[PDB]
Amino acid sequence: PEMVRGQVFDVGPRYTNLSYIGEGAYGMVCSAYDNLNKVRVAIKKISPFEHQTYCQRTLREIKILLRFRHENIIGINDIIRAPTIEQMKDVYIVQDLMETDLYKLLKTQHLSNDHICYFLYQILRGLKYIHSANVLHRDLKPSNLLLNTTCDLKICDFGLARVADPDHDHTGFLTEYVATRWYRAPEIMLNSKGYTKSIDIWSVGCILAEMLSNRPIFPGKHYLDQLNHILGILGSPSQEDLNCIINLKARNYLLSLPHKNKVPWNRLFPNADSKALDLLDKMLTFNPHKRIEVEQALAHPYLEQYYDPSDEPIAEAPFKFDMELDDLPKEKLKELIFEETARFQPGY
Ligand SMILES: COCCN1CCc2[nH]c(-c3ccnc(NC4CCOCC4)n3)cc2C1=O
Known part of the structure; x- marks a missing residue:
């Protein structure tokens, strides 16, 4: 588990050699090396689960980007999260850098x-x-x-x-x-x-x-x-x-x-x-x-x-x-985020 600006980035092992590149109210963006595609990527850590407003916004962002495919629009390459709702503290979106x-x-x-x-x-x-x-x-x-x-x-x-x-x-x-x-x-x-x-x-x-x-x-x-x-x-x-x-x-x-x-x-x-x-x-x-x-x-x-x-x-x-x-409630929104990200999980 690498650390960037006092924030834990639980993205390994595929993604290593992290560097700060951006921020928001409930998220942090880092650049990282993807060991499978052998290219550097952008990883956004989203921590929304403590606020209902942030959960709504997270589900929308994920749902929208997963549907979109366009040269002038940042896409989602991968989604990282814990295997269970219980262990899921954050959600990581992987994007082209x-x-x-x-x-x-x-x-x-x-x-x-x-x-x-x-x-x-x-x-x-x-x-x-x-x-x-x-x-x-x-x-x-x-x-x-x-x-x-x-x-x-x-x-x-x-x-x-x-x-x-x-x-x-x-x-x-x-x-x-x-x-x-x-x-x-x-x-x-x-x-x-x-x-x-x-x-x-x-x-x-x-x-x-x-x-x-x-x-x-x-x-x-x-x-x-x-x-x-x-x-x-x-x-x-x-x-x-x-x-x-x-x-x-x-x-x-x-x-x-x-x-x-x-x-x-x-x-x-x-x-x-x-x-x-x-x-x-x-x-x-x-x-x-x-x-x-x-x-x-x-x-x-x-x-x-x-x-x-x-x-x-x-x-x-x-x-x-x-x-x-x-x-x-933020607990029900947590569930829909979990279900929306399921397809990216190993052993799905
Ligand atoms: C917490 O999130 C809030 C919103 N937000 C903040 C800004 C942002 N940047 C990127 C991104 C993606 C790919 N590649 C790069 N590259 C950098 C560009 C600037 O210079 C250094 C590299 N950035 C994503 C997001 C984003 O969604």
């Missing part, structure tokens, strides 16, 4: 317009497959976009992913949210639970802006500050976009603000490709009903040298409904 992430890359490197175009194409190609499966990623950000030296990109971290539920998306003003602040769509703070595909498109728009300048476009200092940054650039929403906001607290908040004019994309990004800024504008649309969809984004003139719908696959088996796991 990637060299870096877009967050690490943007901290140090200027991207050429060809690199932005290629990385954006891959994000949208992977996102087309996810949305085609009736799934929402809900935490797209640069650290969840993995890269190698040949510029291949893979979307990772489906820990907050859900089946889309547009009929149950409505909520109140400033209602609590999980996903990362800077990549949060304005409707999250206003009237959305983030159960529609347009949530992911906003995050992609924030990522594109960030690839263009190496700086987050909307860097809210805290939860409440986020809408200030968005409206600071986009300007006051139109009468038509306000009439779509029917909860009075959110509407009246927006109506109380002094008029703010739109900051043109060409002033924020004076070196950017005019086609890239046109697509950015359509992704960073205030009204989610007017926001560009993934298949429209792929067909945008900015991506014309890559666009090929016959080479942009969709999911063979989309998820029909979400799982109703909210009332299920």
Whole structure:
């Protein structure tokens, strides 16, 4: 049993020579050597069993990744856990190892317009497959976009992913949210639970802006500050976009603000490709009903040298409904995680 940052990684003997590569609230990621396939891999230790919320998220992440197979999406190669429910303290997901992430890359490197175009194409190609499966990623950000030296990109971290539920998306003003602040769509703070595909498109728009300048476009200092940054650039929403906001607290908040004019994309990004800024504008649309969809984004003139719908696959088996796991206790969720991972066990 190897040890990384005071965390036991019970993955042997197949997986050895571990090294820290990432973290979350209830998990840790390591790189390791796979003695069977003779390659280095990424291993994610998930420790969710003490919290019901974490158990729901674990079962979703596993179920989703086991169904998905796409070049621009991190897959599951193996799942390690103890042979019995009693002995199962953690769950280890084995994934292909990637060299870096877009967050690490943007901290140090200027991207050429060809690199932005290629990385954006891959994000949208992977996102087309996810949305085609009736799934929402809900935490797209640069650290969840993995890269190698040949510029291949893979979307990772489906820990907050859900089946889309547009009929149950409505909520109140400033209602609590999980996903990362800077990549949060304005409707999250206003009237959305983030159960529609347009949530992911906003995050992609924030990522594109960030690839263009190496700086987050909307860097809210805290939860409440986020809408200030968005409206600071986009300007006051139109009468038509306000009439779509029917909860009075959110509407009246927006109506109380002094008029703010739109900051043109060409002033924020004076070196950017005019086609890239046109697509950015359509992704960073205030009204989610007017926001560009993934298949429209792929067909945008900015991506014309890559666009090929016959080479942009969709999911063979989309998820029909979400799982109703909210009332299920963490002990019952532990059982479903055990049953979902059974196929990877020796002597199965
Ligand atoms: C506790 O989990 C929370 C969510 N989450 C955190 C980030 C993350 N990274 C990887 C991963 C997979 C493959 N290859 C690499 N490679 C590294 C990229 C960065 O540079 C060093 C190598 N990372 C998976 C996850 C993940 O699911």
